[PDB]
A paper describes a structure:
The structure of the soluble part of human P4H-TM was solved with X-ray crystallography in the presence of Fe2+, N-oxalylglycine (NOG), and Ca2+. The crystallized construct consists of residues 88 to 502 of P4H-TM and an N-terminal His-tag, whereas it lacks the short cytoplasmic region and the transmembrane helix. The crystal structure shows that the P4H-TM fold is composed of two well-defined domains: the catalytic domain with the DSBH fold and the EF domain. There are two P4H-TM molecules in the asymmetric unit. The two P4H-TM molecules of the asymmetric unit occupy very similar conformations (RMSD 0.42 Å for all Cα-atoms), and only chain A is discussed unless otherwise stated. The P4H-TM structure contains an EF domain with two EF hands between residues 190 and 251. Calcium is coordinated in a pentagonal bipyramid conformation by seven oxygen ligands from residues listed in Table 1. The active site iron is coordinated by His328, Asp330, His441, and the oxygen atoms from C-1 carboxylate and C-2 carbonyl of NOG. NOG is coordinated at the C-5 carboxyl group by Tyr319, Thr375, and Lys451 and at the C-1 carboxyl by Asn455. In the structure, Asn368 and Asn382 were found to be glycosylated, whereas Asn348 is located in a part of the βII-βIII loop where the electron density for the side chain was not well defined. In this P4H-TM structure, the α1-α2 loop is partially disordered and positioned like a lid in an open conformation.
Residue numbers in the entry:
A (entry chain A): 107 to 181, 187 to 481
B (entry chain B): 108 to 176, 188 to 343, 351 to 481
Write the structure that this text describes.
């Protein structure tokens, strides 16, 4: 028993409220959407603090955000059971949008209509070349040929799901006083318990170079009664079943002005319904943030010092964490000129209140013991 | 040996019939005279483009460019090309070798200035004051620590090589013979030049504008024949292996331009060598068409039938691919600018054929 989780009311799109986060000046929280519940705070960071974060990130050294895949995907399905899973509309034919909807099949590579049809042509999977695999065409191909194509596929990071470099910065005791003042500022903003905030993932600093992108995704995975949160798991490192990120909130800081592109897109923000049938189509995949940013419902233009933040889950009706909010779908749009620097604070809450409770009060046990 | 046959462009748009296979007719169309640039539609069948792609895929492609690992007043006056006591952005951009494999942009230079705080006033210009209040260590370690994407490199693609000599696939050397009849050159020169290069440009790939051969000095050595070793490619023959859904043109930024002037080529706001940003501003673009071959001369004549200086107008690059993939193959014809070296080289190679 920890008490109800604070969830800020969006009230309506465009609602601005004064908030006091620093004694010096006033800040203003603007509601950008309700689905997902998404806010914006101009000037959350000073120009000096942005430049400090970048420099601390550069001094540590960045690494490729996503490893270049070397293989096909692995997870027990017979070939036809895979067909039945892919054929959403059950017409005996795999349309491009149905293949596109299973991006995990790319095993890290981002699939496009062109990349799919180029693979079809290489392994001769589509004899009549219409972009559709009928049941006969699907059953007529040896999946070993598909595997061999994935094993030898050589492509650039612009063909990945995630195309950026990043690192992490500590914010607890023993860190630069500015890095710790920022954590206290996030704590004062989200009005969550100090335990929750100071136990979440360290600050991630991301550099998008000219040409970088991050196709649209959600920050936290589904909630089953057996899913396991990495932040709450006793073992420092594992490759367990059901491991997932349990990020209650995402706080995103724009560390610089971007000369061209680089927006954050929420493709279905405040859309009346959420329908993957129109999200992913043969001609337009709204998750592609290299091609179709301009068609998403809402974009946030990077502005130095601005923080945007949003909840990744719905409420559950009792003050804790509900299902994931499908509308929190978001990506990093293609950077056309210059580099884009951002930082994100993820607030971790286990969807099981009892499991989170055992993680907090024992993380305090070890501070006393150690 | 005999004088190198150099085809006559006549005028832009001039089209002449040529017979390279006995099946059909080909047509050589002049695209420009500076550089001397031709286009032949349907040079390759749709089946041979599919075979070249299929062959390269099996061999496996490698990343085309690997990511990188005197005084200051010697350096300042060497870059201050207009001698105005300032380093304009265009003057830093003019020396891409300083990027050491990274492509420099106005935004990347100004990003680096602010990192090491070289520009207090932030106007983008490095005064002599600002440039000596500098210290080259910091700049060196900025390049030390710089990690960036392949889209920030000069060359952003993957490639491999396919052999065309004896024992190779019968379709392959049939292309080599077709190239020979097209160029009207000595079988010694063609069959002793580099193997065919197959390049894959992924979506988001590019190759910034460059020339295919280094300058001519009495002390340069051709790799096909290490102090100042450079590539001596007399001709470049480029094959388009697929239709490209978006972008991926070959740009010749200064084709048939009245003069060649790097002051207008590289400016503070527009670098015409940048094939990610400014392809639409170049003089001439070739749209990839499956089967089409384009070819051009990288050197000027010398007036005596051999190889002159580099043709600056041959500057060219691969434009950003916006949708899909772009596959091309290119044949490089190597000729030694010193005819004496080229003569001894192919006559000696004749030894190891009849000796073997
Ligand atoms: C592809 O091919 C094209 C064509 O070949 C080529 O373009 C040429 O590029 C050059 C480089 O960019 C251009 O060079 C300019 O020219 C300006 C002057 O501009 C004009 O005059 C041209 C010549 O005019 C005459 O002759 C014609 C016949 O040839 C005739 O028809 C005309 O009527 C005109 O006639 C008169 O003058 C004659 C004497 O010249 C006389 O005999 C006659 O009786 C009559 O009185 C003219 O052709 C131009 O017209 C074109 O261009 C403009 C602008 O592009 C168009 O709008 C227009 O429609 C025309 O198409 C134009 O009218 C020079 O001032 C300039 O020199 C500056 O820059 C160079 C850099 O190269 C420096 O070396 C030089 O020192 C000087 O520097 C200053 O200025 C620059 C910024 O401009 C700064 O960077 C410097 O720091 C310096 O700064 C200054 O600071 C001072 C104070 O501190 C201050 O005092 C200064 O004002 C300034 O602020 C340079 O030479 C050339 O014009 C282009 N030619 C054409 C035809 O376009 C491309 O470059 C090629 N592409 C590539 C990639 O190579
Ligand atoms: C963000 O939010 C958006 C809004 O919520 C959301 O958009 C919604 O998207 C879905 C899915 O993309 C759309 O669903 C489609 O609707 C089509 C019908 O289109 C018309 O009708 C609807 C509903 O209309 C009535 O009701 C309202 C009130 O509710 C009234 O105001 C209207 O006047 C209208 O009135 C009458 O009808 C009522 C009964 O329905 C009566 O009660 C009443 O009295 C009236 O008589 C309208 O809203 C539509 O308007 C929109 O579009 C038109 C232009 O098209 C605009 O002018 C207009 O302004 C609106 O913007 C429209 O008029 C269905 O046909 C369609 O069904 C097919 O596809 C789905 C999946 O996509 C399948 O489940 C389904 O089985 C159908 O399958 C076929 O067709 C596809 C298409 O090719 C095939 O690929 C497929 O294989 C299948 O094939 C078969 O049929 C084909 C022909 O049908 C044939 O060619 C084949 O050969 C094969 O045989 C689908 O249900 C929905 O309309 C959108 N709503 C709106 C408001 O836009 C969006 O998705 C959200 N975004 C994201 C990312 O989630
Ligand atoms: C980044 O861009 C913003 C947007 O223009 C700049 O903000 C402007 O000017 C003052 C200067 O601090 C700010 O208080 C305003 O909020 C901004 N103007 C508007 C209209 O919003 C900001 O200065 C830029 N930062 C850098 C480092 O270039
Ligand atoms: C690649 O594109 C070219 C040009 O769009 C296609 O060529 C045309 O070929 C058809 C016959 O198949 C002619 O009817 C058109 O007139 C041609 N157009 C031009 C501009 O020459 C070519 O078929 C395409 N190849 C592939 C494999 O898609
Ligand atoms: O880079 C952007 O604008 C989008 N950011 C993210 O998806 C993230 O790192 O959580
Ligand atoms: O990609 C293109 O069209 C340009 N190609 C080249 O510059 C080359 O490989 O020599
Ligand atoms: Ca189907
Ligand atoms: Ca088919
Ligand atoms: Ca200068
Ligand atoms: Ca300055
Ligand atoms: Cl509300
Ligand atoms: Cl890469
Ligand atoms: Fe994200
Ligand atoms: Fe080239």
């Amino acid at each position: 028993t920890l008490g109800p989780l604070t969830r800020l009311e969006g009230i309506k799109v465009g609602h601005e409220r004064k908030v006091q986060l620093v004694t010096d000046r006033d800040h203003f929280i603007r509601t950008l959407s309700l689905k997902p519940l998404l806010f914006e705070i101009p000037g959350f960071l000073t120009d000096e603090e942005c430049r400090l974060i970048i420099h601390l990130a550069q001094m540590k050294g960045l690494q490729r955000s996503q490893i270049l895949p070397t293989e096909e995907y692995e997870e027990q399905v017979s070939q036809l059971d895979l067909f039945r899973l892919l054929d959403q509309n059950r017409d005996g034919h795999l349309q491009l949008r149905e293949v596109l909807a299973q991006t995990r099949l790319g095993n890290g590579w981002w699939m496009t209509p062109e990349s799919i049809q180029e693979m079809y042509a290489a392994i001769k999977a589509d004899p009549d070349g219409d972009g559709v695999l009928s049941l006969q065409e699907f059953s007529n191909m040896d999946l070993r040929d598909f595997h061999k194509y994935m094993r030898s596929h050589k492509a650039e990071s612009s063909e990945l799901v995630r195309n950026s470099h990043h690192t992490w910065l500590y914010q607890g005791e023993g860190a630069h006083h500015i890095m710790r003042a920022i954590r206290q500022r996030v704590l004062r903003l989200t009005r969550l318990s100090p335990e929750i905030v100071e136990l979440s993932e360290p600050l991630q600093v991301v550099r998008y170079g000219e040409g970088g992108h991050y196709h649209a995704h959600v920050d936290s995975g589904p909630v089953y009664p057996e899913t396991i949160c990495s932040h709450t798991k006793l073992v420092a490192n594992e490759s367990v079943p059901f491991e997932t990120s349990c990020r209650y909130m995402t706080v995103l800081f724009y560390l610089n002005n971007v000369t061209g592109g680089g927006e954050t897109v929420f493709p279905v923000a405040d859309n009346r319904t959420y329908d993957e049938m129109s999200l992913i189509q043969d001609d337009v995949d709204l998750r592609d943030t290299r091609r179709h940013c301009d068609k998403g419902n809402l974009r946030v233009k990077p502005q130095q010092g601005t923080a945007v933040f949003w909840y990744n889950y719905l409420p559950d009706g009792q003050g804790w964490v509900g299902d994931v909010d499908d509308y929190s779908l978001h990506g990093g749009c293609l950077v056309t000129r210059g580099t884009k620097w951002i930082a994100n604070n993820w607030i971790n809450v286990d969807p099981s209140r009892a499991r989170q409770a055992l993680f907090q009060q024992e993380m305090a046990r070890l501070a006393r013991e150690g």
